[PDB]
Every structure is written in structure tokens, then in C-alpha cells.
Amino acid sequence: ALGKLQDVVNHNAQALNTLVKQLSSKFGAISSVLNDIFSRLDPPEAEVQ
Amino acid sequence: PTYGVGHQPYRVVVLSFELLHAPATVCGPKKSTNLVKNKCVNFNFNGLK
Amino acid sequence: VYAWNRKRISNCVADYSVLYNLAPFFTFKCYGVSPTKLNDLCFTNVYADS
Numbered sequence A: 001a002l003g004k005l006q007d008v009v010n011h012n013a014q015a016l017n018t019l020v021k022q023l024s025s026k027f028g029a030i031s032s033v034l035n036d037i038f039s040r041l042d043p044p045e046a047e048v049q
Numbered sequence B: 001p002t003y004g005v006g007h008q009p010y011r012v013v014v015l016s017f018e019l020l021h022a023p024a025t026v027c028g029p030k031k032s033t034n035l036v037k038n039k040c041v042n043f044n045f046n047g048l049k
Numbered sequence C: 001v002y003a004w005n006r007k008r009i010s011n012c013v014a015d016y017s018v019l020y021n022l023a024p025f026f027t028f029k030c031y032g033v034s035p036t037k038l039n040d041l042c043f044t045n046v047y048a049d050s
Helices: A001-026 A034-040 C016-020
Strands: B014-015 C006-009 C045-047
Touching: none
Parallel strands: none
Antiparallel strands: B014 C045, C006 C045
16 A cells, blocks of 8 residues: 555665676776775876776 | 806796785785874775875 | 796785885786785785796
């Protein structure tokens, strides 16, 4: 019965958790951690990563 | 010793590294400091900054 | 060349800076890591092939 409200509570969660899952993607880079990129590579080549 | 630089002998050393999920055993000369807890500090662990 | 000497260097403190005075280094190229900033990363087991 109280579903139309629960959906508003559910989708918002799917709007946040998924937005968190996007932080684990590399987007074509070597990793998803900026510290590991800054420590291994130098800025001249870390800019493109 | 009379040939050109293109034919001169060159000593070459290849240092191959390994980054696995294991207690690291070879790093550089960085003095370790004390562990101060409950304070926002800059942590600089073996492979995590 | 066909019998390049491979040695496992474990449980050490790798100070690459001393490698610049005991032997004059020419073009130095590192793949995967930068030439500098090698004193703040601790590897697990390194291998020297000479």
C-alpha cells in the first residue's frame, strides 16, 4: 500500500549507490586510485591519466 | 677502444619490481615515525598515501 | 648476455641515489614507475638482471 513513497526512497538510493560505484571505474586509465597514479608516474605523464 | 661509441660495451642492469598483496620487504631510505592516533594526519604507508 | 645474472634482492633498503655516484648513469628509463619518487614506494620482491 505504501509503495509509491517507498519507491521515492528506493530510487534515490539507487541514485547514490550507483554514483558511488562510478568511483571504482578507471575510465580508460591505469587505475581508479589517484594516489597510486601520482606515486608511480610523474606529473608530466600523470596529467593524461 | 678505437671503435665508435655504437660498438662500445655497455653494462646494463634491469631491476624488475613486484607489487603483490603481501608484506613489502624492499623500500627506500625513509625514516619511519611514530603512530599518532585520533588525529587527522597524512599517512604514507608502503603503497598507500 | 645469454647467461645474464639474476639475483633476488629481498629484505633490503633500496637506496637508488647511491647508484648515481658509484656508477655514472646514462639515459634512465623506467616503465610503470617514474625515474624519481622510488624511495617512497615499498615493493615486495625485486630482481636484478645484469
